Amino acid sequence: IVGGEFTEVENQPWFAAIYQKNKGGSPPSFKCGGSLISPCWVASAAHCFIQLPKKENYVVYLGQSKESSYNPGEMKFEVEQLILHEYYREDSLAYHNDIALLKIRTSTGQCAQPSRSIQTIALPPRFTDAPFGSDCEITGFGKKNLKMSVVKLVSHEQCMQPHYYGSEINYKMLCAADPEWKTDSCKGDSGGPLICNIEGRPTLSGIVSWGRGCAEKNKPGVYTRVSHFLDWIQSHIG
Amino acid sequence: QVQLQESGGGLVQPGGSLRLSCAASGFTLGYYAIGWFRRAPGKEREGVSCISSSGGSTNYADSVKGRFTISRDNAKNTVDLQMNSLKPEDTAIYYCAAEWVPPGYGATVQALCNNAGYGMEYWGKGTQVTVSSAA
CATH class of the missing domain: 2.40.10.10 (Trypsin-like serine proteases)
Structure with missing residues (x-):
């Protein structure tokens, strides 16, 4: 975090x-x-x-x-x-x-x-996610007290670009990052929630899974797509 | 091999004083918040007095405020309960219990002490404190 x-x-x-x-x-x-x-x-x-x-x-x-x-x-x-x-x-x-x-x-x-x-926390409807560009919030003790931050969902097309992650991203995954690349989840946030709004209801859209670096440019956090x-x-x- | 062991139990005259001590073996007691709980005849377990791992925070049941004093020595691996102005109402088995408080909560040990000690990790076998005119 x-x-x-x-x-x-x-x-x-x-x-x-x-x-x-x-x-x-x-x-x-x-x-x-x-x-x-x-x-x-x-x-x-x-x-x-x-x-x-x-x-x-x-x-x-x-x-x-x-x-x-x-x-x-x-x-x-x-x-x-x-x-x-x-x-x-x-x-x-x-x-x-x-x-x-x-x-x-x-x-x-x-x-x-x-x-x-x-x-x-509420589960998403099947195969339903917030639109890309939405504000989701992450939380953890990752890299003393509980912190939360805001990231944006990134489309798979953008995420699967070669200078991003290429073919190591599938659709059972969800990418999210700070457009300013300054906030992101990190080591120790693993398993933590990715909270997006779906019909104005807070929803567990993602589970922190992996990522190259933390808040590294062009490399956003990757999440298990709960939907x-x-x-x-x-x-x-x- | 973790053990908690109370000591100091005995028979005292009403108005008298008595000191209890809790010692640990097999682990470092200093990482743990300690609570003194007691069960009187007939009633259920209640928190008498509790103290945080560093000793910075304490809590007392209203029954014993101004009469009991809890303290600890993280060098000697102990926690003490000083009991003054003892009343017959204080007669009970006194237990020592230890619980590791994770980071990310308030500094208080009040909820640790007001809930009959359910969830406390480690327990001693207890020691008897009897306050009576028979002493």
Whole structure:
């Protein structure tokens, strides 16, 4: 997350900080961002979990904000299900089908309860995206506190230009960047949300997946196009 | 091999004082917020007093404000609870619990202490504090 502002208790209340556990009583290590799409389900990127795909290795935190008081009973979650897309592959530079689902629950077995600091984010209609040039917002702890920024959707035609990414971009992906190339997602934003408006409703359009550099000119951030994974998602969710 | 261990439990006369200590073995307690919770006969677990990892932030239940004092030594790997002006109402099993507070939240440990300690990562076996005229 290069540039932008720090969020507050009502900014990006769907954001999930995904940590990896360390041996013994050592504090956990931040691993990835994620989005609460259902009270029991967080959507993230598969490449965040491919090394250690067993659910016991992770813990999810919600409701992060400088004005929100940490309550472990309602904001800390164990992972009772870790689902990576079965056709996740690592290419030369791009990830393919880079999406994962985490089913969460508190120590008393409850799911996420909506509050000032914890809300779900709506999924897009099938194959529906905001028009190119739209303002979407990204969020993360990537390259101390939660930040958010604004990027613009970039058309595939523009993105698939040789001096961009060429044929390493397919239509199950979404490109987004700052026209001034000053703001963008970076290392550590992986799995985090790309929020676009669709019918004036905030929508999880993208999942941070990859990119050559950060806010590098002619190279925008690449995202998993969520509108093309609804059938997959709801096949595990409901 | 992570262990939390309370000590200092005993029998004291009403109005007396008593000091509890929580020690950790197998890990560094200083990274953790610590809470003292208690369960009296019949009632449910309640937060008595809590303190952040660095010790900068504390919280007290109204019942014990001005009577209890929580403190810690991150060099010696301990957290202490000083109890003055003890009342019969204070009779209970006192637990020590530790929880790592992720970055990105408020500095307060109030919500950590007001919620009966559900979700707290580590727990001691507890120590008994009895306040009675039988002492």
